Design a protein around this ligand. Sequence first.
Ligand SMILES: [Mg+2]
Ligand SMILES: [Mg+2]
Lengths: 124, 124
Amino acid sequence: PVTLVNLTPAEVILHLDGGPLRLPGADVVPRLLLSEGRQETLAVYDPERPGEAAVAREVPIAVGATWLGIDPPLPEPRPGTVYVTSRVVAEHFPERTDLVWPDDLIRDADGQVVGARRLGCLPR
Amino acid sequence: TPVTLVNLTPAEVILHLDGGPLRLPGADVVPRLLLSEGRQETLAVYDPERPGEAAVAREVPIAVGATWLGIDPPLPEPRPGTVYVTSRVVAEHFPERTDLVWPDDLIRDADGQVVGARRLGCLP
RNA sequence: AAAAAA
Ligand SMILES: [Mg+2]
Ligand SMILES: [Mg+2]
């Protein structure tokens, strides 16, 4: 058996047949490193006032912000440890066979992710 | 000319802008990715409540290498003056579509849950 | 794996 270590900032709950398995969120919020891309503004109608250009909002948009890396970097592989991260992180480290993501997600009444029915990992 | 933002994601999207927030209601129906089954296995994991005790280890389903097949529902057809808010993972799978954006530069609460975004992102 | 670290 392996120890699961949650690198994601939210609590991860795996809904298993005998009851849930709960992994606490990481102590520090991790981040992706992205380029700025081309910084523009998108004029959007205020959903409160549809079709009224007079009271349209200016929304910042990053056009083509690109993956530069992650901060912090992945922890080194440790015997008997499997790291729970995001799929997007795992896909950027395909050599790592100790990375999984929560998968087959469960959402609440507000459409927010609250759990997962399984883990996923890259082809091996 | 301003555009109408349409939220295709199941959660409420809040863009935290300088003049006040812009709120987009969640989609009425929870959309899903279509994935292959991959190789279905089980991962023996220590119960975080009882670390290192193999006796009370849990069995976690894992899908190894489940692959993108498509989406259900499909994207709405392009409409003049409409921009669709979706996930980055969906947008990246439809690079020809220049009317897709995702929420970006995310804000997380004390429990590590996404509660807002400071900008939009789109492909180069 | 549908809110660039579920
Ligand atoms: Mg809803
Ligand atoms: Mg996501």
